[PDB]
Backbone:
């Protein structure tokens, strides 16, 4: 499973989810095509677990880092 | 890193964290000695991501499952 819904409606998402598929899931709106690629791109480095950024009205937080691999993300809608 | 603190004070924790070390971290109070072992023990099966249970005044939620391995947990204090 690449994506699951938590009890509060927020999403746990695999770093490999393609950005195209992500956009379609979130109903939202390079040098990347997956969610993990996008995070590396934003930070310009491999982020710590618990770091986050805001993208297309959503907060993306790193929740699991396996070696250098951004394995799992938490997505929550702002507001 | 086996454990990190999120912005809201909740913990992201590796399934391998020993229960003894977990108790000491949470300030809390078999057929298991790690956090992942405890989850498998509770559910009596490999749980889905997003499943959770309450233990010693804390909520434990599965956030990343890698094959059969319970890789990452979210811990939040109740109340
Ligand atoms: Mg991990
Ligand atoms: Mg995973
Ligand atoms: Mn993982």
Residues:
């Amino acid at each position: 499973a690449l994506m699951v819904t938590r009890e509060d409606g927020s999403f746990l998402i695999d770093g490999t989810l393609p950005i195209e598929e992500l956009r379609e899931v979130l109903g939202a709106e390079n040098n990347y095509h997956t969610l993990a690629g996008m995070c590396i791109s934003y930070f310009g480095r491999i982020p710590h677990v618990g770091e986050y950024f805001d993208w297309a009205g959503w907060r993306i937080e790193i929740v699991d880092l396996d070696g250098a691999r951004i394995d799992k993300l938490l997505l929550q809608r702002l507001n």
User: Anything to note?
Assistant: The domain at 1-79 of chain A is CATH 3.30.465.10 (Uridine Diphospho-n-acetylenolpyruvylglucosamine Reductase; domain 3). The CA atoms of residues 19 and 68 of chain A lie 19 Å apart. The pocket of magnesium ion (ligand 1) is lined by residues A 64, 66, 71; B 14, 71-72 (CB under 6 Å).
